[PDB]
Amino acid sequence: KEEIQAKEYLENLNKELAKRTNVETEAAWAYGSNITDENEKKKNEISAELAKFMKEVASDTTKFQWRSYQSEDLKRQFKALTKLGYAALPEDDYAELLDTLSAMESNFAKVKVCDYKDSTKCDLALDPEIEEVISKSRDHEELAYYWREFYDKAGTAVRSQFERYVELNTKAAKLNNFTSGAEAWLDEYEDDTFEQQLEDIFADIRPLYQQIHGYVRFRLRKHYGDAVVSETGPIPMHLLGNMWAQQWSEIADIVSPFPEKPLVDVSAEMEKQGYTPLKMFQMGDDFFTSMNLTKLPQDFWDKSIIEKPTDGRDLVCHASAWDFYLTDDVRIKQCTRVTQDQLFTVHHELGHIQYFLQYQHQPFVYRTGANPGFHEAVGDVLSLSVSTPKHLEKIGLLKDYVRDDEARINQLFLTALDKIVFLPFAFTMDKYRWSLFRGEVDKANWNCAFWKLRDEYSGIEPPVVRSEKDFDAPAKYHISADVEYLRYLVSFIIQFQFYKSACIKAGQYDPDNVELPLDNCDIYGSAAAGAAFHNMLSMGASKPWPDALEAFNGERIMSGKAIAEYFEPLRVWLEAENIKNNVHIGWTTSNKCVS
Ligand SMILES: *[C@@H]1O[C@H](CO)[C@@H](O[C@@H]2O[C@H](CO)[C@@H](O[C@@H]3O[C@H](CO[C@H]4O[C@H](CO)[C@@H](O)[C@H](O)[C@@H]4O)[C@@H](O)[C@H](O[C@H]4O[C@H](CO[C@@H]5O[C@H](CO)[C@@H](O)[C@H](O)[C@@H]5O)[C@@H](O)[C@H](O)[C@@H]4O)[C@@H]3O)[C@H](O)[C@H]2NC(C)=O)[C@H](O)[C@H]1NC(C)=O
Ligand SMILES: NCCCC[C@H](N[C@@H](CCc1ccccc1)C(=O)O)C(=O)N1CCC[C@H]1C(=O)O
Ligand SMILES: *[C@@H]1O[C@H](CO)[C@@H](O)[C@H](O)[C@H]1NC(C)=O
Ligand SMILES: *[C@@H]1O[C@H](CO)[C@@H](O)[C@H](O)[C@H]1NC(C)=O
Ligand SMILES: [Zn+2]
Numbered sequence: 001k002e003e004i005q006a007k008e009y010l011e012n013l014n015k016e017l018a019k020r021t022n023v024e025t026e027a028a029w030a031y032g033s034n035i036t037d038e039n040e041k042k043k044n045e046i047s048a049e050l051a052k053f054m055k056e057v058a059s060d061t062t063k064f065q066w067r068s069y070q071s072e073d074l075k076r077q078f079k080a081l082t083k084l085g086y087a088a089l090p091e092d093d094y095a096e097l098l099d100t101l102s103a104m105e106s107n108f109a110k111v112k113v114c115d116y117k118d119s120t121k122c123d124l125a126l127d128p129e130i131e132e133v134i135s136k137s138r139d140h141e142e143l144a145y146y147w148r149e150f151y152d153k154a155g156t157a158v159r160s161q162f163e164r165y166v167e168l169n170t171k172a173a174k175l176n177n178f179t180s181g182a183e184a185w186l187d188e189y190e191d192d193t194f195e196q197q198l199e200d201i202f203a204d205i206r207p208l209y210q211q212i213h214g215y216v217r218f219r220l221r222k223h224y225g226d227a228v229v230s231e232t233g234p235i236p237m238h239l240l241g242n243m244w245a246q247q248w249s250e251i252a253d254i255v256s257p258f259p260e261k262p263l264v265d266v267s268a269e270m271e272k273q274g275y276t277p278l279k280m281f282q283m284g285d286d287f288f289t290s291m292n293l294t295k296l297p298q299d300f301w302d303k304s305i306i307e308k309p310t311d312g313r314d315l316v317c318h319a320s321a322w323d324f325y326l327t328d329d330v331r332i333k334q335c336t337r338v339t340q341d342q343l344f345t346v347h348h349e350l351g352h353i354q355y356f357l358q359y360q361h362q363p364f365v366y367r368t369g370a371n372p373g374f375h376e377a378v379g380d381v382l383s384l385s386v387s388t389p390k391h392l393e394k395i396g397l398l399k400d401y402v403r404d405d406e407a408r409i410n411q412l413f414l415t416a417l418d419k420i421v422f423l424p425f426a427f428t429m430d431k432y433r434w435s436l437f438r439g440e441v442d443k444a445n446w447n448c449a450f451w452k453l454r455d456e457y458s459g460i461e462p463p464v465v466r467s468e469k470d471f472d473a474p475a476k477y478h479i480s481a482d483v484e485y486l487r488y489l490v491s492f493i494i495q496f497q498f499y500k501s502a503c504i505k506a507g508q509y510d511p512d513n514v515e516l517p518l519d520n521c522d523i524y525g526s527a528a529a530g531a532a533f534h535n536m537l538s539m540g541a542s543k544p545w546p547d548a549l550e551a552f553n554g555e556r557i558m559s560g561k562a563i564a565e566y567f568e569p570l571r572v573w574l575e576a577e578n579i580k581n582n583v584h585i586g587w588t589t590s591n592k593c594v595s
Contacts, residue, residue: 351379
């Protein structure tokens, strides 16, 4: 009979937590939109106040015999409340951690480098100045300059802060009785075999990655020459069109299977048609509403930041989506540019927004993703259909396109340069941090431990020799900003499970029909695919994630079958092409990190 009282306790507590988290989120928004010493102080002081309340909440849960309850729902809510995270730390330790975290994120956001050609102009930021060069320049010495300048300033400058962060993250995890921060993060997936599952899936897809890597290296040798790219060594990462070599789509024009056949790049047509950031977001909104999903509320349009501010202010430009835990107060902060890549980013971020809107009726503790990978997958499912020649022709961004066998391979390869290449990258981000959290790497070996993983899994390496005098991991946003990365590995796998099922539901994919291939499916306008999204997303975290997956397509298991199915036509072509051209596969151990 205690359950009746507990039910009323939770109902009230959830609403209180939403209200208190609203205040924290507003402060965090203000700081991210506007980096100042005063906003930093405000963000961290509100966080400390919320942490103190959570601690009292965790303490109060012991007054309830919640493990004895009949209701799985009540038990699930109470269990969520016992998990404190960083809030478990002593008052002083939590304050220090907050200061360390803001030091790292603000350092990242304030990085400025000098122009390669003009050592007087020193106001080039990553977004958009440096990223523009990395994506567009084919001058290998220019690329190497910007790589070194950025990593030195975004990575190395923050080593001592990162070290204290690891220490306090570990202390926090242990106060929650996890072994380390690795176990704390993994707890979000509610499955004690989750690591092994991902190792198994990765092993199945790894051979395809090896083939893509080999072919790209072959093509880069033809472009840059053997003085710059070896046949048998790891690929110099500054040549891959991305600061972290996480996705290689930006160099597709020089590595495309059939260069005389069409390669989709709609950036120029977007500009020609007078596209704006506003129009891009309106188009994303249109896609969701077309599937009978929820329209963006007025607060979104009023309060979002969709262009980089033109005043002198510092801010976090790294695109993000925000839930304020009231009703319909959801926002995006994106330094939007008019490019194809940015159009996908718009859809990714709007996927988060849709999830927020779908579960906003749930009790506070359930107002989050089924697991962190689910949140990341939503927007990418739409991006997959947006990226198709089918959809791009509908919106008039792709003209005079003939979709023959060769054009199809180009498009599949372009997609793989984003989707397959990313898998080892994503895995290494957390394998690295897990190894630090678990105390498996001595402090003397922290930098080369990072590059060892990037070599082992991705077969890439720095453009210049690094050592333990450098510290390169925090040069990636999520590492400086303490954002778990496994969510993205999970997302890139399960988004294909979602995409395939949504395509089947939309009547857009049949494995026995040549006219309905998975790689040209467009789910625009499909209420049937939208219904599946509604069924899943409306659950939030009310049930363990296999139940959320089951609500979508009746499946309960994370599987690499769907991603492999999507790329199967590419795998067949590429294996044969690599044999035809005697392409070397695999790589020697890198010499670019001195121990
Ligand atoms: C992470 O793991 C930690 C363990 O490694 C864990 O820390 C333990 O939490 C326990 C609370 O659950 C706590 O147990 C209490 O111990 C008290 C005395 O211990 C002190 O002296 C010891 C010397 O012998 C030292 O070793 C300790 O460090 C302590 O200083 C007891 O006084 C206390 O008892 C009371 O509470 C129980 C409540 O239990 C329930 O009560 C209800 C009543 O409604 C029953 O129906 C139910 O069946 C159940 O019994 C009462 O039973 C009892 O009458 C007393 O009122 C209690 O046993 C322990 O001290 C603590 N540390 C260690 C080292 O064990 C953390 O909590 C974990 N953290 C998280 C977040 O989970
Ligand atoms: N040109 C970059 C746009 C970035 C878009 C996206 N941003 C992240 C931001 C995450 C975040 C967590 C906590 C606080 C603040 C922000 C996202 O998942 O939206 C992202 O990082 N993504 C999208 C998938 C891959 C991953 C990346 O790029 O590494
Ligand atoms: C940023 O914050 C400062 C104080 O920290 C405030 O005075 C200023 O108005 C803010 N800038 C913008 C553009 O909102
Ligand atoms: C739109 O969604 C509602 C429920 O949210 C559903 O009942 C209805 O069938 C959907 N519209 C169409 C045309 O399917
Ligand atoms: Zn995301």
